[PDB]
């Protein structure tokens, strides 16, 4: 390896998005360039729509994916992942005036790896509150998978990008959403989004898997080993923690 092409969505702030000039920027872009410097590889970032991000990697259109991608079990069936470069729980989003905000949270930190009758009870409480409530999620995400598998009785609308979800929630076309704390905290910290609030349990595991990793082809064992070495070094020296505070406003490093 001498040069690699890394794909990113280009519409998932603060992980990957476009600045004023249209240049790809964000946590994934900064970390991508840092990791490649540690690996002694030339780094080229390309914009790719979420719909064909995994098949374009397997087809050989580029060598890696750094696009806020959760290491989820369904994805592991198709591609390989590096070591997680960020750890984030999942939570719900609504409006600041929404009665949903008054709901009691019995389990603050909800792991989904092995749902006990008590965790199922907390999940069912929310499902029942969420009936009649219009839900919005980005298509092809772990958010959609959670909603279809864990809360099937809840009506969901799928969107092209997360920016369309945010638009519709602010507009009043949808009542609530789901995404990670890493996306939602920078969003709710913005003064333009004082009308948006995070709520409910903070969920980990199950179909959300463990952390955000680099998407690599399964046969590219050597490229995975290189990224794993680079990621461990970037975490140990505090580079991931620095970029996490710089882009998310808190430490989400493993
Ligand atoms: C970290 C990020 N992961 C999601 C959503 C996502 C990543 N890129 C575009 N959408 C996923 O892997 O399906 C999130 O939950 O907020």
Swiss-Prot record:
One MF annotation (Gene Ontology) recorded for this entry: ligand-gated monoatomic ion channel activity
GO cellular component: membrane; outer membrane-bounded periplasmic space
Annotated compartments: Periplasm
Matches recorded under SUPFAM superfamilies: Periplasmic binding protein-like II
Spans through the membrane: none
InterPro entries in UniProt: Iontro_rcpt_C, Lys_Arg_Orn-bd, SBP_3_CS, Solute-binding_3/MltF_N
Disulfide feature: 36-43
PROSITE patterns with a match to the protein in the record: SBP_BACTERIAL_3
Keywords, in A-Z order: Disulfide bond, Periplasm, Plasmid, Signal, Transport
Pfam families named among the record's database cross-references: SBP_bac_3
Physiological role: Component of the nopaline active transport system probably consisting of four subunits: Q, M, P and T. This system is also capable of transporting octopine provided that catabolic functions are induced with nopaline.
NCBIfam families per UniProt: 3A0103s03R (TIGR01096)
Assigned protein family: Belongs to the bacterial solute-binding protein 3 family.
Protein name: Nopaline-binding periplasmic protein
Organism: Agrobacterium fabrum (strain C58 / ATCC 33970)
Gene behind this protein: nocT
């Amino acid at each position: 390896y001498k040069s690699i092409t890394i794909a990113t969505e280009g519409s998932y702030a603060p992980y990957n998005f476009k600045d004023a000039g249209g240049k790809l920027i964000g946590f994934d872009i900064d970390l991508g360039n840092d990791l490649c410097k540690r690996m002694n590889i030339e780094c080229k970032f390309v914009e790719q729509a979420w719909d064909g991000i995994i098949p374009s990697l397997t087809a050989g259109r580029y060598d890696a994916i750094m696009a806020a991608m959760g290491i989820q079990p369904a994805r592991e069936k198709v591609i390989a992942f590096s070591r997680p470069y960020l750890l984030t729980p999942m939570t719900f989003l609504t409006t600041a005036d929404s009665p949903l905000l008054k709901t009691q949270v019995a389990i603050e930190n909800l792991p989904l790896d092995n749902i006990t009758p008590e965790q199922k009870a907390e999940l069912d409480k929310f499902t029942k509150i969420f009936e009649g409530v219009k839900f919005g999620v980005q298509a092809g995400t772990s958010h959609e998978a959670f909603m279809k598998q864990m809360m099937p009785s809840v009506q969901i609308s799928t969107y092209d990008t997360i920016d369309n979800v945010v638009m519709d929630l602010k507009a009043g076309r949808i009542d609530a959403s789901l995404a990670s704390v890493s996306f939602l905290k920078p969003l709710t910290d913005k003064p333009d989004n004082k009308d948006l609030k995070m709520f409910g349990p903070r969920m980990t595991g199950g179909l959300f898997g463990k952390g955000v990793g680099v998407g690599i082809r399964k046969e590219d064992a050597d490229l995975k080993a290189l990224f794993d070495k680079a990621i461990d070094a970037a975490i140990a020296d505090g580079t991931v923690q620095k970029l996490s505070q710089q882009w998310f406003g808190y430490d989400a490093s493993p």
